[PDB]
Point group: D2
Chain length 95, copies 4
């Protein structure tokens, strides 16, 4: 493990977008971008599992737009992950 934090991956994407005059796409434009990326993942999941490198890369593509979305709206995905994990966190002492 190197190992990169979620905070750093977000900083890394923020640094890349920061160079452009355009900046982040508007949230609704982002949502279209995500739908587009998800389609490319769907295509690839269907190709390999329907009726590691390509499918690995299409996840990264989706993850990038997600980070963009999250950065655009000042959302920290580590926090986001934690609130989901807390929702699944059972009150059962045996687990």
């Amino acid at each position: 493990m190197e190992a990169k934090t979620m905070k750093d991956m977000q900083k890394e994407v923020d640094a890349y977008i920061g160079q452009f005059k355009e900046g982040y796409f508007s949230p609704l434009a982002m949502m279209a971008r995500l739908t587009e990326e998800m389609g490319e993942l769907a295509r690839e999941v269907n190709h390999y599992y329907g009726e590691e490198r390509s499918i690995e890369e299409e996840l990264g593509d989706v993850l990038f737009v997600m980070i963009c979305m999250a950065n655009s709206l000042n959302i920290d995905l580590e926090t986001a992950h934690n609130i989901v994990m807390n929702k699944f966190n059972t009150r059962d002492k045996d687990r």
Copy 2:
């Protein structure tokens, strides 16, 4: 900041799924789950820009599930996308 690495967040989800007899959804079923979560995100984005923090988390969870299912490390994924966007221009 703690701060949590991508590998840790993936390990964390794998430990959660690992307790069930079922384990992971098959990839095509995952893809359906992912389409489902994306719609919930779309709803929230439209509502606020026509909750987001949580619905992004929800989509991220399914992503991690998908990646774990196929033994894919999302740090490597992120890196190979960053390499693609990385320009050979000395000025940038």
Copy 3:
């Protein structure tokens, strides 16, 4: 009593949206709406295959499709026809 045409189905949706001051969602907002409905379909496909509820969720996506098409003066009969043309091979045996 007899089958409804795609043109009429579009006219029907246009008549319904026509009564509102706001009218059609902008194309990018429609796409968000369409993504939302697709998720509900996905949910229901997963539920039954991972009857009536799935029939309804297809209706929901079809409605937003029609809204999208109407919004951009696109006729879905014509759209469907270019797809059929794209697939209809020049093979005499088929």
Copy 4:
């Protein structure tokens, strides 16, 4: 100049698919196909609104939907009607 009914459009797709040994994709595979086409629609909506290419990509989405519907013996005219009934108001003035 017909014009074409939804039932016929579905019959037309069923006849096209009916020639192949493989037949219809399973519902979960269909859903993946549909997610794929939606992305291509999204791409095209973003390009022009972030138009003839949108007409084609709407068609492609409509095709997979027809496939989906045929696959599960669902009539899309019926589906459309339940959605219209859902929005049908009990208001006498509308």
